[PDB]
Amino acid sequence: LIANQFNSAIGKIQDSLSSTASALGKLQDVVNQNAQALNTLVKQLSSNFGAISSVLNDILSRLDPPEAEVQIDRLITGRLQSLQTYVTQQLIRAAEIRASANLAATKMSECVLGQSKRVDFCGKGYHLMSFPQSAPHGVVFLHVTYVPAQEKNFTTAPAICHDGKAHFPREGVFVSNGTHWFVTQRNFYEPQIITTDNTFVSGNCDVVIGIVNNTVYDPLQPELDS
Amino acid sequence: PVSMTKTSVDCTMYICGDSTECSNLLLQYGSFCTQLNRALTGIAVEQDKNTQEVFAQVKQIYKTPPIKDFGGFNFSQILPDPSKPSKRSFIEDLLFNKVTKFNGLTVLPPLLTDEMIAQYTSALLAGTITSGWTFGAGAALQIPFAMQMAYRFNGIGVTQNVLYENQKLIANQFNSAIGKIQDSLSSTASALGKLQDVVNQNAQALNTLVKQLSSN
Amino acid sequence: IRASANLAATKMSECVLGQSKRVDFCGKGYHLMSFPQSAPHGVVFLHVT
Amino acid sequence: NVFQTRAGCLIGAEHVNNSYECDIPIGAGICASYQTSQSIIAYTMSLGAENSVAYSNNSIAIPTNFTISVTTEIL
């Protein structure tokens, strides 16, 4: 069953990626801002910056240097100011990416190279394993996760008295289907009979609150009797 | 800190106080201001994204059951209080009280009003008290708060029977500990320094911006 | 702020939604559970440890 | 067909009581969308389906099944 659930799950990822590009928004966004920034850079070249002409050669022509120097100087301050802005934008934008890269490294080191118990750090839900896929100027992860689907209501009790001694489950919790008391593992319904093996005794009945009477079967005794 | 004041400043209104002559000169500089207006937009929309990521991490809005029977623990302080007009818990308001133009400067409103944020923190808090960590994984699963705490001990390596034997003592230690939180926030404002520092820097940033108008 | 926002975002997911075994990522001491509370332009956590 | 909000004056969008998932953000809690005969509607945001949990002091819900779901994370 799990193989089929895993194989189909990969199948949908194709279709979501095949038809809709809304997933790839984040990488495409990086391209636009950088590409758009350059368009602003070259655009500033055509701007006059308060001089007679934006084309530098037309200033070299159309008048001799001693006056033309004043016109060029006005051009330089405008152009130089454009770089100051454009570079300063990159450094700040470059810092954003580098912060994202370090997050990717941590996410790669801690998701694909190993299981991660950090909640919601590697995909929604309980995490099993992760696959990296390269993408233009980026990385795409497939987080394979375990999500508990169908649940039931069971009456529960913190502990069980058997002979005046409180019993606590070694692992999992006590659940009753209404008439019988079982211990089942935490994240899956696998009911199984109470034994001294599942339960470790501690203390006395009175202190615990909500403790319920029941019987604790002991494996050894029938073996002894038979 | 999570978000800062979403401000947008107009190109021309700041630079030229509605002079066409001043405006025409500005067109020579080309596309400077339109990237400034655009850069400040990039910041602005980002903040509404921040508050999404911090709070909008729960797919459904859980609410606590009416009767507050939580094995002795007392979340009346942190749980929402209906009597107060904004659906805010008591400790939240101690926060909202402790923490405290016309030249093209506009302050855009945040997308999530302080009411709606209070519903997430009510939802997240309601989820933790009835379902433990489960609502993060998938459908939230009810589990008695006595046991969920007993799980949490078992997480840090203390066996379960420590809690159930000492439930009463833990409850008072937890209830009293909440009590000290109110007083530390109610009396001492040094706690909220970081949020207050964010606000002061921004207000101080705008004032310096406006002061620059009146210099030769 | 964005760096602070994500740090809250991570701390929200790994500390409120679940118990976290990272040390001092969730207040001093062994961590049990944490509660979120809203605040002006920020979030305040209670760390039950 | 004018609607007044804290964001500003909103012209050409019809107010509705019904709430939905935020589609196009206006701010201060109103998001606008295209919906049915189709037009533009502006509505208060819906923060998600309301879901109270059937809590009690002796009731626990155990999953009986699982789904292996693979998700995509892009950086």
Ligand SMILES: *[C@@H]1O[C@H](CO)[C@@H](O[C@@H]2O[C@H](CO)[C@@H](O)[C@H](O)[C@H]2NC(C)=O)[C@H](O)[C@H]1NC(C)=O
């Ligand atoms: C709860 O589970 C127990 C264990 O499976 C059920 O007890 C069994 O019931 C079947 C009939 O369905 C009998 O054939 C078995 O002999 C019973 N086992 C024992 C040890 O008595 C019980 O019926 C279930 N009850 C509910 C309400 O779910």
Ligand SMILES: *[C@@H]1O[C@H](CO)[C@@H](O[C@@H]2O[C@H](CO)[C@@H](O)[C@H](O)[C@H]2NC(C)=O)[C@H](O)[C@H]1NC(C)=O
């Ligand atoms: C669990 O069973 C025990 C008996 O083994 C019950 O203890 C009895 O409690 C009543 C009420 O105080 C006393 O009158 C009896 O004398 C007790 N029996 C003995 C042998 O001392 C206990 O009440 C039961 N608890 C539950 C929750 O069923």
Ligand SMILES: *[C@@H]1O[C@H](CO)[C@@H](O[C@@H]2O[C@H](CO)[C@@H](O)[C@H](O)[C@H]2NC(C)=O)[C@H](O)[C@H]1NC(C)=O
């Ligand atoms: C949880 O604690 C609050 C106190 O923070 C309790 O509310 C108080 O209840 C007493 C009655 O026992 C009143 O006299 C006080 O005026 C209440 N204080 C406030 C601020 O309302 C509440 O009863 C406790 N809940 C439980 C179940 O014990």
Ligand SMILES: *[C@@H]1O[C@H](CO)[C@@H](O[C@@H]2O[C@H](CO)[C@@H](O)[C@H](O)[C@H]2NC(C)=O)[C@H](O)[C@H]1NC(C)=O
């Ligand atoms: C656990 O859930 C899975 C979810 O698929 C169930 O598997 C389906 O079972 C039906 C039977 O009616 C089949 O028709 C489907 O093809 C199965 N799905 C897949 C993906 O194989 C499974 O039956 C459930 N188990 C229990 C015990 O309820």
Ligand SMILES: *[C@@H]1O[C@H](CO)[C@@H](O)[C@H](O)[C@H]1NC(C)=O
């Ligand atoms: C558990 O009981 C509650 C009682 O209100 C019910 O609403 C819920 O649907 C039950 N769980 C399931 C899985 O049916």
Ligand SMILES: *[C@@H]1O[C@H](CO)[C@@H](O)[C@H](O)[C@H]1NC(C)=O
């Ligand atoms: C559980 O709550 C019920 C009220 O619905 C009460 O009668 C009972 O004593 C409580 N049991 C425990 C163990 O708290």
Ligand SMILES: *[C@@H]1O[C@H](CO)[C@@H](O)[C@H](O)[C@H]1NC(C)=O
């Ligand atoms: C919302 O409902 C009220 C009554 O419940 C009604 O009077 C009002 O007209 C409705 N709003 C719209 C936009 O139809």
